[PDB]
Amino acid sequence: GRVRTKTVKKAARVIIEKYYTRLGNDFHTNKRVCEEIAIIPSKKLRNKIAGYVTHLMKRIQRGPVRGISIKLQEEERERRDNYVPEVSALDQEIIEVDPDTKEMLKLLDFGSLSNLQVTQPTVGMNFKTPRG
């Protein structure tokens, strides 16, 4: 069939990793870019490389690719990972607590807290799946 080899996939991965603002979706334009910027000693290898670059960018403008890393999808992840909320999501106005751990906290270092309320336990104990 038509399965690419190590040299085509590796060369395509490094030319997308090193260049993104010059390469595009049209096969002839990035084919001529791969002529100019990369040293390819043949033509079939050049065409296979340019075709895999076209397919890889058709993947990239849809979603992320785990094999390579380019600057535009870089630091959008760090913007996503460096967010802050308004409320800290831990200093809520009421915290539910079980009677057993409430009695544990009564003997630990405190007698009563200002932000806890005792709930009611279950009427029965059935907590494992039927296995035997």
Partner 1 sequence: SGALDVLQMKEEDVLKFLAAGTHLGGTNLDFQMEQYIYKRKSDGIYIINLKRTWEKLLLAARAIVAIENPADVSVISSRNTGQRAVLKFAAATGATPIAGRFTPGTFTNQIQTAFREPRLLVVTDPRADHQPLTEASYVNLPTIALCNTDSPLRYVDIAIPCNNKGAHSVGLMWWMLAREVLRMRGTISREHPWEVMPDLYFYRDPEEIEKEEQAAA
Partner RNA sequence: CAGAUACCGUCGUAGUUCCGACCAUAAACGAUGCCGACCGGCGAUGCGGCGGCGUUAUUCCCAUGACCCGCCGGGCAGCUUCCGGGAAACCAAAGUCUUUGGGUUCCGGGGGGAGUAUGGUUGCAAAGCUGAAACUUAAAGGAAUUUGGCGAAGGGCACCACC
Partner RNA sequence: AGGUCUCGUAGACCGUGCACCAUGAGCACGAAUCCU
Q: Which residues pair with 99 in a beta bridge?
A: none
Total binding residues toward partner 1, as defined by CB under 8 A: 30
CB of 95 to partner 1, least distance (A): 5
Q: Which does 132 bind (CB under 5 to 8 A by kind): RNA, partner 1, none?
A: RNA
Residue 120 in contact with residue 101, Cβ under 8 Å?
no
Segment near RNA (CB under 7 A), from 13-21, 64-72, 87-95, 116-124? 116-124
- CA–CA separation, 59 and 129 (whole Å): 43
Q: Which of 7, 25, 69, 101 binds partner 1 (CB under 8 A)?
A: 101
CA distances from 28 to 32, 35, 81, 103 (A): 6, 10, 38, 74
Three-state DSSP at 97 gives strand
User: Rule CB under 7 A: is residue 125 a binding residue for RNA?
Assistant: yes
Footprint on residues 55-94 left by partner 1 (CB under 8 A): 80-85, 88-92
